[PDB]
Structure 1
Amino acid sequence: NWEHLLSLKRQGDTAKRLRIELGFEVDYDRIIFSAPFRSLQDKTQVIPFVHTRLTHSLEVSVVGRSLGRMVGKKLLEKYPHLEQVYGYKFNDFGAIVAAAALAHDIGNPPFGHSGEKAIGEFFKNGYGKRYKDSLTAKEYQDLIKFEGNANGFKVLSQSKPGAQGGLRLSYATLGAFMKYPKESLPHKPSDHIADKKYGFFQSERALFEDVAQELGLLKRSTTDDVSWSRHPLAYLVEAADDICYTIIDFEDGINLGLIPEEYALEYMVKLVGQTIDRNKYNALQETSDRVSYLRALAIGTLINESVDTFMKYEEEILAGTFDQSLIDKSNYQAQITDIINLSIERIYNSREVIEKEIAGYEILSTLLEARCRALDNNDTHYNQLIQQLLAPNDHSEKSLYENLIQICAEVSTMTDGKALRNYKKIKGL
């Protein structure tokens, strides 16, 4: 039911909010001005001009806003009652998808997936193994299979003294942000696209249950482990992100010298052939302009194809029977796969990227060990100094799992500069 999916409800609301009577734009406005989003300006994208996480978020938001606007147009033309009595507009869908896409990278720890694996391995085989017997199975699982999507949900909606609900985003935006509406256990029960990872920690189970019950998400789990169907706009958000990750990593790889210019045309002829102006392409004198020209065309065709795919399986998506992505139903699957493999071989496996990941591991391991050692023995002078350096903000009487997840969130959201400086101080440099 689309009426419940486009909920304007926020945390702490008592009276129901109706479309015909704050707005989805306000979510984007709040995310833009938020400190965690601003902090993305000092966070890199594990590549050797090259995009930072802030620009990637910006570009993803721009693709998601286009996808959502077209999808809202088509749904409003398919469900007249959504605008006749409920008063919804395609700009609403665009705003929801753009706000969800803008914050999709707000909780990811530095150094890419290597940082996530470092946080996981710290609690699996490192100093964090001591907490295994003091936590429940799902809590420990969250600790060992730490992902930045659950951390991003935590950042977007975590209460603090004087700020309940965090950014207080609308429930539609929160639902679109959740790509994996399931708990930390069981680990990958099936081949469904939404079961690859989890989207919320144990400290957010009640809040996401409230969000799902407000949005009317279908309960797909018959056991005691909660799991819901994906929000239909989460498909658009993820498709936008994949389109950017594919076409823009290739642009960045080509412009940085890691990928020769020939592969650009070689893997973009199929994508851009239907709309390329050959005279304009040949008239361009710089490689950067040509690759930008190709990137714009490819993004446009992929956006249109994703909209067509979404409207092809709307009923299946709303029922929860869709087990793959919108980009997986692409006619350009071979070319997309070839581009992804070439990017993996030339960028992600480059020395510079490997070197950086090896440093992240040592920095994150050191910081996590220092924070945990301070947590266990908060009486020594060195531990008091560590607490002052890394957690001067506040202190409270919380549980062990809450403290550990707070440590993980604080370490994940540090800027590369702040993390490196703290690691050097702790290492006496």
Structure 2
Amino acid sequence: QIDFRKKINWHRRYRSPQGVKTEHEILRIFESDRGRIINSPAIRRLQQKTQVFPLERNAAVRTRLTHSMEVQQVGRYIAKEILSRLKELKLLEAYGLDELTGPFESIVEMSCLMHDIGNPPFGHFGEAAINDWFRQRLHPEDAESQPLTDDRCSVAALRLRDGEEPLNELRRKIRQDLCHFEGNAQGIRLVHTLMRMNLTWAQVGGILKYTRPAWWRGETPETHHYLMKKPGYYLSEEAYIARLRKELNLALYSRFPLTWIMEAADDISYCVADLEDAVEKRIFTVEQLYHHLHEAWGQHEKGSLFSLVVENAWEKSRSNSLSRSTEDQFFMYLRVNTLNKLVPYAAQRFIDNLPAIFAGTFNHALLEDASECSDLLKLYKNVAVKHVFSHPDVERLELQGYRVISGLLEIYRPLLSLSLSDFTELVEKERVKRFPIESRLFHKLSTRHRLAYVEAVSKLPSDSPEFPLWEYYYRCRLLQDYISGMTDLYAWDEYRRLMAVEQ
């Protein structure tokens, strides 16, 4: 049975409110979440991480932040559309949404703003740099099935040792987890553990995009192949996601229902803006873009999406009043026409499949990989892939980012090439006499990250035989937190500085 009062959970993990609360009181809780996010440093840092182009002098080109804002507006429209559609069907009160219209919209909007919040400095390639660096260090595949005669893991405490013990199972998970950094999983870790934001359960469910655990080592079940596409949460947040599943009535591996909407807003906004920026960067003219889109659509008919959306924008751009630029006019109507077709479709799909979406078990996206709407989105991606993401300036930035994050990890390698007693001594005494380098390296790590390491390790049972395994897991999480929390420019700056090349 569908009752959104049971999914839109306004409680918090810490210092929680309890007890009935009016519509207006519930409104205030979710607006509090809004203020927490908007004033978060993690949101402000998005204006200096890059979205496709190198982020140059005139802010003409999008950043992770301005992209998110554009995405947030698409998510707002879908939510408004779903709700409006439901009011006309008379299902509003029946679905328990009559006193939750605002929060429903707000949760979607903030989840849009908050994708990419856990993304490392150079996007897809920073993740790559992290996971590649730890794979050569941990070799999780040599921990697949029972000890290997010669384990290539660099760490004594993690080596799959002597054909015995369950720990081998914990080692199996730790090694896999640390080699599957994923921005979405880091986002949950960020809003809960690092920033200590104390969001509502509903809000955090909205950024839990995938439900596969990072330590998962096999093929995902046939029934959940889509919701488990990428890792969604880390080993370190397993207890927290457990409490979240209970609070949001999630089965294991089930998704929060508003996540499908944010996912659709991502899918829509994923590309068009990058073409507009490509025209700004003078890569091709708007005229050339129309023909690249005309060519890649192929099977052309009077009546198709192409005709109704992208051909429409091309004609409007030719002979307009409102003294607007041709390119301004083309892209404005490319954006609007795309929204007018793709938002209602996403909203309807949400409603048509609301039972499985509510249960969180619906193994599909709103813009289903089959549909004609997904074909329009594939159209934009095909052009962007062959003509924008391949541009040398973009590709070089990707090369540069990979070397920067890779090199940074080596600079902090000393902190990992240390025994437990050694690293622990560095945590208690601020100045360790015989470890001058590791000392100073330790203090560069942001205070929030060191605090989360101390807090996590202190919650462990001191005497357990798995303690050194857990400590190392948290030590690595400490470093990955520090790196992934940087901006593109900060990480570039620290790299050059710690190799001594700035003044």
Q: TM-score range by the shorter chain?
A: 0.7 to 0.9
The question of whether the paired residues in 1 share the 8 Å contact of 2:313 and 2:330 is answered with: no
What number of residue pairs does the alignment pair up? 414
1:296 to 323, 336, 351: 336
Q: Which residue of 2 aligns with 1:133?
A: 159
The question of whether the paired residues in 2 share the 8 Å contact of 1:64 and 1:236 is answered with: yes
Q: 1:71 is matched by which residue type in structure 2? A: I
Distance, in Å, in 2 between the alignment partners of 1:197 and 1:145 is: 9
The question of whether the paired residues in 2 share the 8 Å contact of 1:8 and 1:19 is answered with: no
Whether 2:454 is the aligned partner of 1:388: answer: no
Distance, in Å, in 2 between the alignment partners of 1:401 and 1:80 is: 47
**What SS does the corresponding residue of 2:75 show, helix, strand or coil?**
helix
1:189 to 214, 220, 225: 220
> How do 1:301-312 residues align onto structure 2 when only pairs under 5 Å count?
301-312=341-352
1:417 and 1:82, CA in 2 relative to 1: closer, same or farther beyond 3 A? same
Whether 2:200 is the aligned partner of 1:170: answer: yes
**What's the CA shift for 1:392?**
5.8
**What's the CA shift for 1:257?**
2.7
Q: Which residue of 2 aligns with 1:64?
A: 75
Cα deviation code 1:154-206 (max 9, x no counterpart): 1111167xxxxx11111111112111123120455146221111211111111
Q: 1:25 is matched by which residue type in structure 2? A: E
1:271 and 1:327, CA in 2 relative to 1: closer, same or farther beyond 3 A? farther
Distance, in Å, in 2 between the alignment partners of 1:333 and 1:358 is: 30
Cα deviation code 1:260-318 (max 9, x no counterpart): 42365454843527986955753144323322332233233222221122122222323
The question of whether the paired residues in 1 share the 8 Å contact of 2:255 and 2:361 is answered with: no
**What's the CA shift for 1:24?**
2.0
Whether 2:134 is the aligned partner of 1:123: answer: yes
Q: Which residue of 2 aligns with 1:32?
A: 38
1:179 and 1:281, CA in 2 relative to 1: closer, same or farther beyond 3 A? farther
**What's the CA shift for 1:90?**
2.3
Whether 2:366 is the aligned partner of 1:314: answer: no
Q: Which residue of 2 aligns with 1:91?
A: 102
Distance, in Å, in 1 between the alignment partners of 2:154 and 2:308 is: 52
The question of whether the paired residues in 1 share the 8 Å contact of 2:49 and 2:122 is answered with: no
**What SS does the corresponding residue of 1:172 show, helix, strand or coil?**
helix
Distance, in Å, in 2 between the alignment partners of 1:280 and 1:118 is: 43
Specify the structure having the higher radius of gyration (Cα): 2
2:18 to 15, 18, 25: 15
Q: Which 10-residue stretch deviates more, 100-109 or 345-354?
A: 345-354
Q: Which residue of 1 aligns with 2:66?
A: 55
- TM-score, length-scaled by structure 2: 0.75
Distance, in Å, in 1 between the alignment partners of 2:365 and 2:45 is: 30
Cα deviation code 1:339-395 (max 9, x no counterpart): 211111112222112211111121111211222313434542222232233446656
> How do 1:205-284 residues align onto structure 2 when only pairs under 5 Å count?
205-219=238-252, 228-262=253-287, 264-265=289-290, 267=293, 269-272=306-309, 282-283=319-320, 284=324
Distance, in Å, in 2 between the alignment partners of 1:344 and 1:274 is: 21
Q: Which residue of 2 aligns with 1:41?
A: 47
Q: Which 10-residue stretch deviates more, 350-359 or 65-74?
A: 65-74
Q: 2:10 is matched by which residue type in structure 1? A: L
The percentage of aligned residue pairs carrying the same residue is: 29
**What SS does the corresponding residue of 1:199 show, helix, strand or coil?**
strand
Distance, in Å, in 1 between the alignment partners of 2:410 and 2:19 is: 46
Distance, in Å, in 2 between the alignment partners of 1:213 and 1:237 is: 22
Distance, in Å, in 2 between the alignment partners of 1:213 and 1:143 is: 26
The question of whether the paired residues in 2 share the 8 Å contact of 1:65 and 1:97 is answered with: yes
Q: 2:176 is matched by which residue type in structure 1? A: Q
Structure 1 residue ranges without an equivalent (≥5) = 161-165, 220-227
Q: Which 10-residue stretch deviates more, 287-296 or 338-347?
A: 287-296
Distance, in Å, in 2 between the alignment partners of 1:256 and 1:159 is: 37
Structure 2 residue ranges without an equivalent (≥5) = 55-59, 140-152, 161-169, 294-304, 419-425, 427-433, 458-470
1:136 and 1:171, CA in 2 relative to 1: closer, same or farther beyond 3 A? same
**What's the CA shift for 1:91?**
2.1
1:109 to 112, 120, 127: 120
The question of whether the paired residues in 2 share the 8 Å contact of 1:9 and 1:171 is answered with: yes
1:286 and 1:273, CA in 2 relative to 1: closer, same or farther beyond 3 A? closer
Q: Which residue of 1 aligns with 2:300?
A: none
1:88 and 1:78, CA in 2 relative to 1: closer, same or farther beyond 3 A? same
**What SS does the corresponding residue of 1:23 show, helix, strand or coil?**
helix
1:373 to 414, 417, 436: 414
Q: 1:352 is matched by which residue type in structure 2? A: D
Q: 1:175 is matched by which residue type in structure 2? A: G
1:8 and 1:14, CA in 2 relative to 1: closer, same or farther beyond 3 A? closer
**What SS does the corresponding residue of 1:26 show, helix, strand or coil?**
helix
1:349 and 1:150, CA in 2 relative to 1: closer, same or farther beyond 3 A? same
Q: 2:340 is matched by which residue type in structure 1? A: G
**What SS does the corresponding residue of 2:231 show, helix, strand or coil?**
coil
